[PDB]
Design a protein around this ligand. Structure first.
Ligand code: SBN
Lengths: 534, 405
């Protein structure tokens, strides 16, 4: 059954012309079929025969669906539309319901009228056995299965059509995704069922047929990742294939499933599992699962045993966000309204990169979270952070970059994030003063790094295969090594200081880490910078 | 009326910029604001056959808690052909200036039918439970660059009388705003302003204090001690050495001499008479902005900002590095005592304003803040009808101690 809705004007990309590809004559069986099938929709008005005044053609195929037109070219030539998927609603962003139902609005694609003008580009051909003279030609008069515009156009159509019902019944929740129609409400079944029918007949009044309550899917609803109930969502537990031999590609997919799991079941680990990848020569090469890997792979089966259940969003309450540090650059967080009744949860791993610190990092977490919150709940969480207000104050007021943390509150959940060290703001009286300097031949990679102090001390070192920076830093490393609890170190390096300012407590550079460790050791350090080469 | 045809710069296509997730409170605000403009016929809902999009959001002013809708046409303005409004160097000197919001005026005038498509924008839904609400302008959009242009004529007329009967007053139009400056003491200024409002209110474009050239560039003062330590000198020399990029006459050898010898930082040092002269001579060169810096209209204006901490912020507008057309400091607004973004945005605003006043042109910003952080909260505190360009950087440690002066 067709429909009476204004068609959406559709045109081909700027200056291109309809598809022009050949038909792949088929078996006696693959042609007989498409002759029947097409005679069907033919009678239903969906497609109409065309003559020679249409120069286009798309490849028609015939696959026996057990237990098809190729528009690839056409699509390329068709204009672009807006967004056929802004973002998927996330479970934690939905509010509970009394009754729920999804209708398979299915083949409504073929109920929506395709722009008449455009129809001509949709021309396809049913070949001949012995390639007689003609072939049986057709074109579409309705949204085609597999065409670029189909979803988009169907999407809108559906929306206009649903605006009034939405109006009449403002306490009802209709959500359209693909060819489904999730509907929720707080009416008791009976009242619910009625409205559904109402609605149902309402669509049907436009040509869009729908399944009887008889053939209609029911809760739990499986929503990409979750098992949906009207009062609770659940983490459809996960399966890990126990097996004899492991191929690389396998481990990959394994660590894949696992990495997605860690968001819900923190504790999950794969550090010893990623190691099985080192050096892998072929995606199909089998690997000897190490004993440490055995102990990990199993400890994970235990974790993923216990399913996870959750709660939906209650507007009348506050959103609470709590964070924890699992290790260096690893943060876990969970969002809830009522303690232990989680709405959502997750974790972030931060590849150290150039030079960061925990506070800076903590800061990035908060930020990320804040953004996804806004997307889901339209508002942002109050935060419970493992950091002392004093610690934060000290750091932020003094960092060279603009930064901020929304209303938050300290939660004493060790291990707290703190500042491993702070450089003195001014020189230390009664402290050795090391004038450090380093230099290396860019070309030869040959260097010397050393120092001299106000207390007579000195040392220098020759470095083979070093560089334009390592030397400088090393200079300071030495200075730090041989100094004792209180030091004053003057250098001319910009790279050195600039960095140490940020008070990094983690770096990509192994060297840097050396210094950091050293710095943390000292009781009081003062670093000063003087122009070079004078 | 008969609409003037507008076109995109050749080769260019409409903007397809993504919408940033908006918070709850402001979604409604927009939806509310929009269902109404639709009635009034300003905008019309569009379909999917339209692939363009621009970001939108809502802000609020003082005594005006009521939400105001704002659109980011930066990309579009960039792709919109050029046209036609001149800049006077008058208000640069005025004793006072007042800014007026004259965006409304535009909604009266229609926009060419085939350009309308490009103005498509979207009202997003929380948790994407609904598709967006696509609209498109039928009238002249606010904050768009073609708008103050097309409304030029009518504007000129409308003002001419207040103009001709008060040639002692300057009137500058920069997009949705109008800058009104007079040397007349506050009494007659404010009153004359209000009078001007009415003059406009009379036609129907509704309109709801600054102090130019009070904005003098800041000096770079060098510390003074009775006694100088090795450290003191070190810091001093570094400062100058760097500063010699602006003033080539600054010299640092005499001081650099006293620093020879591996001595303690705390160690106290007496200035040789030659170092005393050198220094004194340097203090002089710094008493005035470098010579030879002249604003070039054909080149972009640039503004750098540095976080000095304690609520302090310094900046420099320049076109060529080290040849600042103006420089300054800024102390946080009473009440932003806990957040940088708040401050930083306020700052960005004041500066853009002065830029406008002075050269009737906005500066491109280099911001000491991570893009993520900026993009997440800048809207929460914005309050201008325009949006300047910006990029994000890593403040060199030096340029920072220098301006600390
Ligand atoms: C907007 C939206 C998206 C999806 C996927 C499903 C629905 S629903 O109304 O069918 C629904 C199913 C199960 C539990 C819920 N609490 C809701 C609710 N509400 C709504």
């Amino acid at each position: 059954p067709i429909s009476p809705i204004e068609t959406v004007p559709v045109k081909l990309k700027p200056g291109m012309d309809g598809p022009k590809v050949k038909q792949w004559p088929l078996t006696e069986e693959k042609i007989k079929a498409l002759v029947e099938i097409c005679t069907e929709m033919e009678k239903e008005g969906k497609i109409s025969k065309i003559g020679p005044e249409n120069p286009y053609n798309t490849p028609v195929f015939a696959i026996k669906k057990k237990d098809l037109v190729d528009f690839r070219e056409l699509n390329k030539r068709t204009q672009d539309f807006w967004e056929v998927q802004l973002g998927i609603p996330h479970p934690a962003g939905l509010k509970k319901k009394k009754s729920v139902t999804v209708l398979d609005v299915g083949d409504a694609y073929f109920s929506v009228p395709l722009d008449e003008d455009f129809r001509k580009y949709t021309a396809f051909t049913i070949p001949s056995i012995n390639n007689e003279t003609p072939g049986i030609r057709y074109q579409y008069n309705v949204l085609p299965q597999g065409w670029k515009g189909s979803p988009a156009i169907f999407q809108s159509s559906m929306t206009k059509i649903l605006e009034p019902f939405r109006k009449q019944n403002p306490d009802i929740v209709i959500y359209q995704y693909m060819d489904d129609l999730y509907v929720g409400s707080d009416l008791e079944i009976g009242q619910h069922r009625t409205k559904i029918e109402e609605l149902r007949q309402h669509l049907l009044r436009w040509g869009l047929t729908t399944p009887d309550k008889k053939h209609q899917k029911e809760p739990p609803f499986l929503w990409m990742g979750y098992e949906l109930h009207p009062d609770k969502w659940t983490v459809q537990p996960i399966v890990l294939p126990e097996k004899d031999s492991w191929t690389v590609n396998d481990i990959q997919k394994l660590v894949g499933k696992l990495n997605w799991a860690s968001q819900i079941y923190p504790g999950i680990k794969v550090r010893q599992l990623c190691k099985l990848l080192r050096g892998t020569k072929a995606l199909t090469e089998v690997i000897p699962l190490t004993e440490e890997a055995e102990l990990e792979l199993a400890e994970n089966r235990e974790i993923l045993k216990e399913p996870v259940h959750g709660v939906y969003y209650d507007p009348s309450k506050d959103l609470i966000a709590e964070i924890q540090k699992q290790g260096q650059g690893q943060w876990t967080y969970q969002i809830y309204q009522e303690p232990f009744k989680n709405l959502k949860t997750g974790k972030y791993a931060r590849m150290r990169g150039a030079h960061t610190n925990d506070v800076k990092q903590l800061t990035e977490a908060v930020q990320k979270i804040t953004t996804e919150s806004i997307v889901i709940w339209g508002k942002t969480p109050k935060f419970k952070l493992p950091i002392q207000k004093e610690t934060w104050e000290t750091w932020w007021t003094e960092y060279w970059q603009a930064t901020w943390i929304p209303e938050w509150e300290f939660v004493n959940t060790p291990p707290l994030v703190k500042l491993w060290y702070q450089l003195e703001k001014e020189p230390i009286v009664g402290a050795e003063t090391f004038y450090v300097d380093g230099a290396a031949n860019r070309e030869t990679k040959l260097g010397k790094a050393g120092y001299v102090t106000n207390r007579g001390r000195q040392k220098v070192v020759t470095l083979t295969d070093t560089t334009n920076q390592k030397t400088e830093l090393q200079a300071i490393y030495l200075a730090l090594q041989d100094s004792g609890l209180e030091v004053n170190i003057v250098t001319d390096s910009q790279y050195a200081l600039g960095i140490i300012q940020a008070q990094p407590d983690q770096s990509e550079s192994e060297l840097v880490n050396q210094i950091i460790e050293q710095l943390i050791k000292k009781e009081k350090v003062y670093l000063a910078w003087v122009p070079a080469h004078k | 009326i008969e609409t003037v045809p507008v076109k995109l710069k050749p080769g260019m296509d409409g903007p397809k910029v993504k919408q940033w997730p908006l918070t709850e409170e402001k979604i409604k605000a927009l939806v509310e604001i929009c269902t109404e403009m639709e009635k009034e016929g300003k905008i019309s809902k569009i379909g999917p056959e339209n692939p363009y999009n621009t970001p939108v959001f809502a802000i609020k002013k003082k005594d005006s808690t009521k939400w105001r809708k704002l659109v980011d046409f930066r990309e579009l303005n960039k792709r919109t052909q050029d046209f036609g409004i001149p800049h006077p160097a008058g208000l640069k000197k005025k004793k006072s200036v007042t800014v007026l919001d004259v965006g409304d005026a535009y909604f009266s005038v229609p926009l060419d039918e085939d350009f309308r498509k490009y103005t498509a924008f979207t009202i997003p839904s929380i948790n994407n439970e609904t598709p967006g609400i696509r609209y498109q302008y039928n009238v002249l959009p606010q904050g768009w660059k073609g708008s103050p242009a097309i409304f030029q004529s009518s504007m000129t007329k409308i003002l001419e009388p207040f103009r001709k009967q008060n040639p002692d007053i300057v009137i500058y139009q920069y997009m949705d705003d109008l800058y009104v400056g007079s040397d007349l003491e506050i009494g007659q200024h404010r009153t004359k302003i209000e009078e001007l409002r009415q003059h406009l209110l009379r036609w129907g474009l509704t309109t709801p204090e600054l102090h130019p050239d009070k904005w003098t560039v800041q000096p770079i003062v060098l510390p003074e001690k009775d006694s100088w330590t090795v450290n003191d000198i070190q810091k001093l020399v570094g400062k100058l050495n760097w500063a010699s990029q602006i003033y080539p006459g600054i010299k640092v050898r005499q001081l650099c001499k006293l620093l020879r010898g591996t001595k303690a930082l705390t160690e106290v040092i007496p200035l040789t008479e030659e170092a005393e002269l050198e220094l004194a001579e340097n203090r002089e060169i710094l008493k005035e902005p470098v010579h030879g810096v002249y604003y070039d209209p054909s080149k972009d204006l640039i503004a750098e900002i540095q976080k000095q901490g304690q609520g302090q912020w310094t900046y420099q507008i320049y076109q060529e590095p080290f040849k600042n057309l103006k420089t300054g400091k800024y102390a946080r607004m009473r009440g932003a005592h806990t957040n940088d973004v708040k401050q930083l945005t306020e700052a960005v605003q004041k500066i853009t304003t002065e830029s406008i006043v002075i050269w009737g042109k906005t500066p491109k910003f280099k911001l000491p803040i991570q893009k993520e952080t900026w993009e997440t909260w800048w809207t929460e505190y914005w309050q201008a009808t325009w949006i300047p360009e910006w990029e994000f950087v890593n403040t060199p440690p030096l340029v920072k101690l220098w301006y600390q002066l």
